[PDB]
């Protein structure tokens, strides 16, 4: 069974006294007419918990707070017995559902006791109220504040909540309210600011009474349903295969230095392979190598052996290291090598290969069945530069799909922004990339792949207005969305993400589109009267036979 939070959940947010004033204050609060849970048990503590108990003779006893409360770490406790409250943060072995018959501590239906809790800035906050009730199994419709009683400067991590013997429990939410203070300083009334458009009007005007008129209160923004990115082409990669396969392998005597520039690096090809014999990159991670841009890539096809494979690298010296290729102290590069002798050598012996010895090259005559410790393996290492020239050795660019006729966040080759895309009759020039308005803003773009001209329109936006007769007379309000098509208004004001008091006007049986915008909440009539609440474009609204009507003045 669930209960509606009738005008409940109000507590003093600040230790300040105010007489005859309204104060629009923002903090965590339990919404007006929100849903609370009844129980007859472990619960979470998302931000705060509003707790109520409706019993006859103090049957309820205590509570257990904390995160897991298994005594494996900190766990707060609150206990009560014979008009005495014992409070602690000590760690006893807490039972699964404890019942009755150290960094700090403390000591001390017929009646309704209310408890609301929270934690901010490493402190424990309690606001409480005791109310005289005598009725059964319901939440009385009444307004009363919660009074701050205790503070515990613990700063314990609390996410779990327990009760020990009505179990009305409700969570606190970050909502703004318009408090009302009387002369005595007691909170006399309050308004949840997201209950309904009338609440919005009260919040803006800072009043509990609003007279006849149209009151523009909230702005209205459509949000991108998703995001898209586009890019010029699939790829113009380098011929990394040419310096990679190396059937006609390089000579170690003069290590082949290859300059690579102006490509889209196939870093993924030998990075996402998982089928490579020798990889070990030092100075740059092997994971995000596919998203980087460098000026000049030097790939050296070098000759290595079974034992000298790791010799030519920072941290190891050796003959191949000393004579042919010597790694520096802070090389920024990777080691890549195909390690097999079935291909590295020929049948009968690869005598043509030579390793520098009088440095002058000693022949690297690997046998056809040469041992692993003597097997040659083509060794390749890539070094990247940052010269006074454009860096063109770059990773491939991921392009998403072109989704049109929706509010989306796009990224067209760095010309980016948020808008709604529509194919245009506008024709560009075969060298043109994007269009521009008189006031120098982006309006039209060319999709890099299909070479079509699209129109970019701002995501729907505008302001909300509330049309209402004086609350002194009536409590019905008609809402007007400005300069928008009626089709997208409910989801654009987040229809699903609103309380039903808002959803009743997010959509409706009476949606009227005017020149000034789309009006919800007043059925249009075909008569004409001396218009009283002016809407715009000749349209005005009033309260008549009863409901609100929209007509031409």
């Amino acid at each position: 069974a669930y209960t509606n939070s009738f005008t409940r959940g109000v507590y003093y947010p600040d230790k300040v006294f105010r007489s005859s004033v309204l104060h629009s204050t923002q903090d965590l609060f339990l919404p007006f007419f929100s849903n609370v849970t009844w129980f007859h048990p472990v619960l979470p503590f998302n931000d705060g918990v509003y707790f109520a108990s409706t019993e006859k003779s103090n049957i309820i006893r205590g509570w257990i707070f904390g995160t897991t409360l298994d005594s494996k770490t900190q766990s707060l406790l609150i206990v009560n017995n014979a008009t005495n409250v014992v409070i602690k943060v000590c760690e006893f072995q807490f039972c699964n559902d404890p019942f009755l018959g150290c960094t700090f501590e403390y000591v001390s239906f017929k009646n309704l006791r209310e408890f609301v809790f929270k934690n901010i800035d490493g402190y424990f906050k309690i606001y409480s109220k005791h109310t005289p009730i005598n009725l059964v199994r319901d939440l009385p419709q009444g307004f009363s504040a919660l009074e701050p009683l205790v503070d515990l400067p613990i700063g314990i991590n609390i996410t779990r909540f327990q009760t020990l013997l009505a179990y009305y429990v409700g969570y606190l939410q970050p909502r703004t309210f318009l408090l009302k203070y009387n002369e005595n300083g007691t909170i006399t009334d309050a308004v949840d600011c997201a209950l309904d458009p009338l609440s919005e009007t009260k919040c803006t005007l800072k009043s509990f009474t609003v007279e006849k008129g149209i009151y523009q209160t909230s702005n209205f923004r459509v949000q991108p349903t998703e995001s898209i990115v586009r890019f010029p082409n699939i790829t113009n990669l380098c011929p990394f295969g040419e310096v990679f396969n190396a059937t006609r392998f390089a000579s170690v005597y003069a290590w082949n230095r290859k300059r690579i520039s102006n490509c889209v690096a196939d870093y993924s090809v030998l990075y996402n392979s998982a089928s490579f014999s020798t990889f070990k990159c030092y100075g740059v991670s092997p994971t995000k190598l596919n998203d980087l841009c460098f000026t000049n890539v030097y790939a050296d096809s070098f000759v290595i052996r079974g034992d000298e494979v790791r010799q030519i690298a920072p941290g190891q010296t050796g003959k191949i290291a000393d004579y042919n290729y010597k790694l520096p102290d802070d090389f920024t590069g990777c080691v890549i090598a195909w390690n097999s002798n079935n291909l590295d050598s020929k049948v009968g012996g690869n005598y043509n290969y030579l390793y520098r010895l009088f440095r002058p090259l000693q022949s690297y005559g690997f046998q056809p069945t040469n041992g692993v410790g003597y097997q040659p393996y083509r060794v390749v290492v890539l070094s990247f530069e940052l010269l006074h020239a454009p860096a063109t050795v770059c990773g491939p660019k991921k392009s998403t799909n072109l989704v049109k006729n929706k509010c989306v966040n796009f990224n067209f080759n760095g010309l980016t922004g948020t808008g709604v895309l529509t194919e245009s009759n506008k024709k560009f020039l075969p060298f043109q990339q994007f269009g521009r308005d008189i006031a120098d803003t982006t309006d039209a773009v060319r999709d890099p792949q299909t070479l079509e001209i699209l129109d970019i329109t701002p995501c729907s936006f505008g302001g909300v207005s509330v049309i209402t007769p004086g609350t002194n007379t009536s409590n019905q309000v008609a809402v007007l969305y400005q300069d928008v098509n009626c089709t997208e208004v409910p989801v654009a004001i987040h229809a699903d993400q609103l309380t039903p008091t808002w959803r009743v006007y997010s959509t409706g049986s009476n949606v009227f589109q005017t020149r000034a915008g789309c009006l919800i909440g007043a059925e249009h009539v075909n008569n004409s009267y001396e218009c009283d609440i002016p809407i715009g474009a000749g349209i005005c609204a009033s309260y008549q036979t009863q409901s609100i009507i929209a007509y031409t003045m």
Epitope: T278, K280, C281, Y282, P286, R310, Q316
Partner: nanobody, 126 residues
């Protein structure tokens, strides 16, 4: 002197799952990116697989492609060699070793590890 200590061998037949802890003392540990090796008798020093300091990357050879997975530890400063699907010839002396910290990734030459431990020997009997 670095005492690279190993334990976690087993006499179990195909299917039993065991771990290979490589504990060292007197030296930097969390920063040391260390990978596991073995010395199969009838073969020379060989590479099996490797892990890195943040548990960032892995590289598995084609004889332990699905058999071995690697996962580290933080508090007791140790890396394990997880394993499954034992092979009859797989029994040998298993030597995890240590190498000065690498920026990322792995070096797979069995000589690339310089400080060598004592070893944990798994057993497969066929």
């Amino acid at each position: 002197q670095v005492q690279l200590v190993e334990s976690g061998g087993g006499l179990v037949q195909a299917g039993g799952s065991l771990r290979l802890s490589c504990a060292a003392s007197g030296r930097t540990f969390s920063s040391y990116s260390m990978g596991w090796f073995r010395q199969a008798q009838g073969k020379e020093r060989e590479f099996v697989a490797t892990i890195n300091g943040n548990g960032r990357d892995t590289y598995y050879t084609n004889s332990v492609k699905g058999r071995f997975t690697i996962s580290r530890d933080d508090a007791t400063n140790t890396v394990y060699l997880q394993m499954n699907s034992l092979k009859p010839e797989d029994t040998a002396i298993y030597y995890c070793a240590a190498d000065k910290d690498v920026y990322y990734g792995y070096t797979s030459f069995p000589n690339e590890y310089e400080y060598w431990g004592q070893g944990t020997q798994v057993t497969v009997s066929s």
